[PDB]
Amino acid sequence: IVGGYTCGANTVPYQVSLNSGYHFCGGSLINSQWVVSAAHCYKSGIQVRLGEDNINVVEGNEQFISASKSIVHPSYNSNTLNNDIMLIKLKSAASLNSRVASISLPTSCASAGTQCLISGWGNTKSSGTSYPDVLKCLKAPILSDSSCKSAYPGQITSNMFCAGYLEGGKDSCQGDSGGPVVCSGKLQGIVSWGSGCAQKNKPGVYTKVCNYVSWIKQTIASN
Ligand SMILES: [Ca+2]
């Protein structure tokens, strides 16, 4: 997250870190057994880390739980990032508590202009590289579809939305991928892509989770 703030330990209690020997992507806990992330974060051998603040220090509230299954969307296209969503099942149910909690899925899609909370352990620099140890947060508005299409002509599908600041300076970034965009208490986006980070006229692009609620529900009903 570039231009964000330190969230505060365990105040984003649905935020997970996906670990394959190191943090490589975020995700969102949607119930005791399941995490939503980005399909472009797929790796074999994922350990889900819940209750994290500093990902390099054991602080006492973590639950580390292996993935048993990952399910990339049937229509994910890695070339265009359309349908950039993945489900990850945990080998055992998380113990839900004040610091490890699920985030609601949406019923309706989010409104343009809504200020959402984006979080992660990704790069904090627009030019160069610095990865934080503690979880970072950013408040960012959903941009209009017209504005998003203008920014990335030919590349925005109905399953994507843009959010952030066209003047630059505030965005998600590498390593935030797969983590949450929460709007009105619902998981409405997944950190997906963007040209660079926090560059002028190049806002973040996010998977539009409200297009996936029927696939998420039938998949979890079946696995
Ligand atoms: Ca930790």
From Swiss-Prot:
It is found in: Secreted, Extracellular space. Its main location: secreted. Residues 1-221 form the Peptidase S1 domain. It is an enzyme of class 3 (hydrolase). One of its GO terms (biological process) is digestion. Ca(2+) binds at E52, N54, V57, E62. Disulfide bonds join C7-C137, C25-C41, C109-C210, C116-C183, C148-C162, C173-C197. Substrate binds at D171, S172, Q174, G175, S177. GO terms for cellular component: extracellular space; serine protease inhibitor complex. Binds 1 Ca(2+) ion per subunit. The keyword Calcium applies. Its cofactor is Ca(2+). Subsequent cleavage after Lys-125 leads to alpha-trypsin. Further cleavage after Lys-170 yields pseudotrypsin. A cleavage may also occur after Arg-99. Not sulfated on tyrosine residue(s). Its EC number is 3.4.21.4. InterPro entries: Peptidase_S1_PA (IPR009003), Peptidase_S1_PA_chymotrypsin (IPR043504), Peptidase_S1A (IPR001314), Serine_Proteases_S1 (IPR050127), Trypsin_dom (IPR001254), TRYPSIN_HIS (IPR018114), TRYPSIN_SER (IPR033116). Pfam families: Trypsin. It comes from the Eukaryota. It catalyses: Preferential cleavage: Arg-|-Xaa, Lys-|-Xaa. The keyword Metal-binding applies. Synthesized in the acinar cells of the pancreas. Belongs to the peptidase S1 family. PANTHER family: RIKEN CDNA 2210010C04 GENE, TRYPSIN-RELATED. This is Serine protease 1.
